Amino acid sequence: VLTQSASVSGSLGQSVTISCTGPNSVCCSHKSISWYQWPPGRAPTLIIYEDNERAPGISPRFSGYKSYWSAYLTISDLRPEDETTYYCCSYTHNSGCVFGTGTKVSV
Amino acid sequence: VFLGFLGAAGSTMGAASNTLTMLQLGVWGFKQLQARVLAIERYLEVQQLLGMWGCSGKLICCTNVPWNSSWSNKTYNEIWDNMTWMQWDREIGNYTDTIYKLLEVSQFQQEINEKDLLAL
Amino acid sequence: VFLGFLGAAGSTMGAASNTLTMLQLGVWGFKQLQARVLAIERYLEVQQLLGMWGCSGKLICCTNVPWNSSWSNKTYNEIWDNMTWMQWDREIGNYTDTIYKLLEVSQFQQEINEKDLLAL
Amino acid sequence: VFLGFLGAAGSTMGAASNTLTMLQLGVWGFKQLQARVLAIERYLEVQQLLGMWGCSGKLICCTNVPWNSSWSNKTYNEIWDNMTWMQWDREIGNYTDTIYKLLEVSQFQQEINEKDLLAL
Amino acid sequence: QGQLVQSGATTTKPGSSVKISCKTSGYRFNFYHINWIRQTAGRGPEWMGWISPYSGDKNLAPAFQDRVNMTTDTEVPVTSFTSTGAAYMEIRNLTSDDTGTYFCAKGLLRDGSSTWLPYLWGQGTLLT
Ligand SMILES: *[C@@H]1O[C@H](CO)[C@@H](O[C@@H]2O[C@H](CO)[C@@H](O[C@@H]3O[C@H](CO[C@H]4O[C@H](CO)[C@@H](O)[C@H](O[C@H]5O[C@H](CO)[C@@H](O)[C@H](O)[C@@H]5O)[C@@H]4O)[C@@H](O)[C@H](O[C@H]4O[C@H](CO)[C@@H](O)[C@H](O)[C@@H]4O)[C@@H]3O)[C@H](O)[C@H]2NC(C)=O)[C@H](O)[C@H]1NC(C)=O
């Protein structure tokens, strides 16, 4: 039920921004949004949790935002390894993740 | 008496600290006395330091020293909701004396600032 | 030194508290030392408690605990103008440890309230 | 530990204070213990007095006692810029106990003034 | 640190019920929820459920409510902050729709609002 961007891409030096939104049952002002970097069929990676918090070791280039109706994932200064798919979560303190449709990128 | 408040030693730092839920001169005569002196030597080890930081009678005293990120570059949420006082101490144990000295000068200068303030 | 302030032991509670007006190892060598340790064990018995209530350096510290009338249902005028500290202590001696614990949590929570206040 | 802060003993009073820049019971077993008790008897000699003046945890506490010019009729500039703590102490050593008593009553009355203030 | 090694990538046919293991190391197994999440090839990544290796409390999705059995045996102490636990999970009326790689991941923190968030992931187990 949680939709994101169809697809985006950029080049080495610029930035992107992956959308993520849904109805009031999933989005947003009353829920926490997390962002995962997930290569298809392999071990994923946490990058952002509860809106704008960066996981340990995550480079300061990754940024998260959340208006009252949608959440974004800004990937400033792209690199070759950032060419993956991306998914967003929608969770509270006592629940489970409601993942997104999917958004892919490239350079 | 109840100096054993270790009850939350395996809990997270923020769950534990932020929101709790006549002798005879023989070998039991000199043993029991040295154990009585050895206890209050150490209670005054810390209560003196607590006095040198402007923290006498305070369990949670805020200071005037910014956090040098070289001590620990970790977030509030990955400290007080993830680590325990036992292991946080070990991670930051090397700079423990630099912060002490620096706490001491922040309070000493704060003592003379109020001295210049109460002179008016 | 002058720890004998009993001078107003027979006076009313409010008249007294509210408005005052090199050894040799022998039997005098180990006696005089234990008497010296036994004195400061007890001075730190109370000064530690005074620190656990936010009362360090205070002779009259006001607290944040309402008076449970089951402790003593008596008036201010029939306490501080009629009773003496010696006999008031005996009347309220049973609940003396309940109040201590309760004083301790009132100060601990007060330590984190100012912690949330100074965070802004 | 570092109780030897005499580093500025020959400097002027205002340059120093205002702006800094397991035993065995033998003759080393009872010697080392009495030296350990003799140290904290004296740390509590002063920290008790500091508590009786409303100065717990303070290196520079201002008081409520005006300066009796009969103690020393000398200027701020001929004290804190001319004399040293070692010799100033000797000059004012005779009245040192009168000021102590007087400090003690200024704090005791200040304890009941705030008592009348917090009663509202 | 920490590493969650999973089970083998063995395949079965519909009507069966397979168990997937998840052997942890390098961290206190009791301190963080274990979390299984399935990546079906013909759907979106679906969260299956976390269990508490300490409280023994579980929470699944309503799509696996009466279809999944998730358990953990006790942890083996290694040092003051290192344990070795094992996580097990099954599926009831299993079909071929449930085909995909299954992951196990430990929780993020142990307090706050992001407690169980699948931070450290495993190796995945190919089904089919
Ligand atoms: C010892 O170590 C363990 C392991 O770390 C500690 O256990 C963890 O404690 C933390 C809190 O410190 C827990 O985080 C909380 O998680 C709950 C989720 O549980 C809630 O939801 C369940 C499913 O809906 C529900 O069944 C629960 O209700 C009862 O059931 C269980 C047992 O079945 C029982 O344990 C409960 O207490 C209830 O009796 C339960 O309601 C979540 O709701 C919490 O969020 C709230 O609180 C946080 C602050 O804590 C706040 O920030 C939020 O906004 C929200 O208000 C909170 O996230 C964690 O789940 C525990 N388990 C782990 C990590 O595996 C244990 O506490 C340690 N004890 C000591 C003494 O050190």
Please give the number of the atom of ligand 1 that sits closest to the Cα of E52: 65
With a 6 A CB cut-off, is E40 part of the ligand 1 pocket?
no
Tell which phi-psi region holds residue B62, choosing left (phi > 0), alpha (psi between -120 and 50) or beta. beta
E68, β-bridge pairs: E91
User: Which element (helix H / strand E) includes A64?
Assistant: strand A62-66
Is the beta carbon of E121 within 6 A of some atom in ligand 1?
Answer: no
Q: Do E114 and B87 touch (CB under 8 A)?
A: no
What residues of E are in the B interface, CB distance below 8 Å?
80-81, 109-112, 114
For residue E71, count CB atoms less than 10 angstroms from its CB and return exposed for 0-12, middle for 13-18, buried for 19 or more.
middle
Chains B vs D: touching, with 3+ CB pairs under 8 Å? yes
Give me ligand 1 centre to Cα E57, in Å: 9
Chain E residues close to A32, C-beta within 8 Å: 113-114
Find the C102 Cα to ligand 1 centroid distance in Å: 27
Assess whether the C-beta atom of E113 lies below 6 angstroms from ligand 1. Answer: yes
Calpha distance B69→B17 (Å, rounded): 22
3-state percent breakdown (helix, strand, coil) of chain A, nearest 5: 5, 40, 60
Closest-CA residue of B relative to D54 is B56
CB of E110 closer than 6 angstroms to any ligand 1 atom: yes
Residue A50 near residue B81, CB atoms below 8 Å: no
Structure tokens at B55: 């923290």
Residue B59 · residue C111 · CB < 8 Å? yes
Q: Is D60 on the interface with B (CB under 8 A)?
A: yes
Structure tokens at B64: 């005037």
The answer to whether A28 and A68 are in contact (CB under 8 A) is: yes
Nearest to C62 among D30, D37, D115 (CB): D115
User: Cβ of C103 under 8 Å from any chain B Cβ?
Assistant: no
Tokens matching residue D105: 């009553």
In our burial notation (b when 16+ CB lie closer than 10 A, e otherwise), range C66-87 reads eeeeeeeeeeeeebbeebeeee
Distance CA A87, CA E44 (A): 10
Interface of B to A at Cβ within 8 Å reads 74-75, 77-78
Q: How many Å apart are CA C75 and CA D64, to the nearest integer?
A: 34
In chain E, % helix, strand, coil (3-state, to 5) comes to: 0, 45, 55
Q: Do B56 and C54 touch (CB under 8 A)?
A: no
Chains adjacent to E (≥3 CB pairs closer than 8 angstroms) = A, B
Chains that touch B (3 or more CB pairs under 8 A): A, C, D, E
Domain count along chain C = 1
Written as six digits, the tokens of C118 are: 């100074």
User: Is the minimum CB–CB distance between A22 and chain E shorter than 8 Å?
Assistant: no
CB contact under 8 A, E111 and B12: yes
**Beta-carbon count within 10 A of E56 CB:** 9
A86: Cα within 13 Å, side-chain hemisphere: 30
Distance CA E10, CA E20 (A): 10
Q: Is A102 left (phi over 0), alpha (psi -120 to 50) or beta?
A: left
> Subunits with at least 3 CB pairs below 8 A relative to chain A?
B, E
Tokens 């209560």 belong to which residue?
B47
CA-CA distances (angstroms) from residue D35 to C33, D40, E118?
Answer: 11, 9, 58
Q: Determine contact: B30 vs chain C, CB below 8 A.
A: no
* DSSP 8-state code for residue A107: -
In A51-80, the residues whose Cβ lies within 8 Å of chain E are 53, 55
Measured CA to CA, the distance from residue D114 to residue C55 in angstroms comes to 13
Query: Is D53 exposed, middle or buried (CB count within 10 Å of its CB: 0-12, 13-18, 19+)?
Result: buried
Coil vs helix vs strand at A86: strand
Assess whether the C-beta atom of B10 lies below 6 angstroms from ligand 1. yes
Q: Which of E30, E57, E60, E119 to mutate to test the pocket of ligand 1 (most atoms within 8 A of CB)?
A: E57
Say what angle helices C29-51 and B29-51 make with each other, to 10 degrees. Answer: 40
Which residue's CA is the nearest one to ligand 1's atom 54? E113
CB proximity A34 to E under 8 Å: yes
How far apart (Å, rounded) are the C-alpha atoms in residues A40 and C77? 81
Residue whose pair of structure tokens reads 């449970």 in the numeric block: C68
Q: Please indicate whether residue E59, judged by its CB atom, sits closer than 6 Å to ligand 1.
A: yes
Cα A27 to the center of its chain, rounded Å:
14
Phi, psi of B50 (to 5 degrees): -60, -30
The Cβ-side half-sphere exposure at B110, using a 13 Å CA radius, reads 15
CB A94 less than 6 A from any atom of ligand 1: yes
For chain A, what is the domain count?
1
H or E stretch covering B111: helix B96-117
Token digits for C5? 């302030």
- Per the DSSP assignment, residues forming a β-bridge with C29 are none
Domain that includes residue B59, residue range? 1-120
Pocket mutation for ligand 1, best pick of A49, A94, A95 (most atoms within 8 Å of C-beta): A94
Q: Are the C-beta atoms of B61 and B110 separated by less than 8 Å?
A: no
Contact A53, A45 (CB under 8 A): no
CA dihedral A48, A54, A56, A59 (to 10 degrees): 100
> Please, what is the end-to-end C-alpha distance for chain E in angstroms?
31
Tallying the residues shown for chain E, one arrives at: 128
At B30, the amino acid letter reads: F
Place of tokens 């000398």: D74
As a whole number of Å, the end-to-end CA separation of chain C is 45
CA angle E25, E29, E35 (to 5 degrees): 100
Question: How far apart are the C-alpha atoms of C5 and C24, rounded to whole Å?
Answer: 32
Q: Which long-range contacts (CB under 8 A, 24 or more apart) does B104-111 make?
A: B104/B52, B104/B53, B106/B53, B106/B63, B106/B64, B106/B65, B107/B52, B107/B53, B107/B54, B107/B64, B107/D59, B108/D20, B108/D59, B110/B54, B110/B64, B111/B54, B111/D58, B111/D59, B111/D60
Angle at D114 between CA D109 and CA D116, to 5 degrees: 95
**Which residue range is the domain that position A43 belongs to?**
1-107
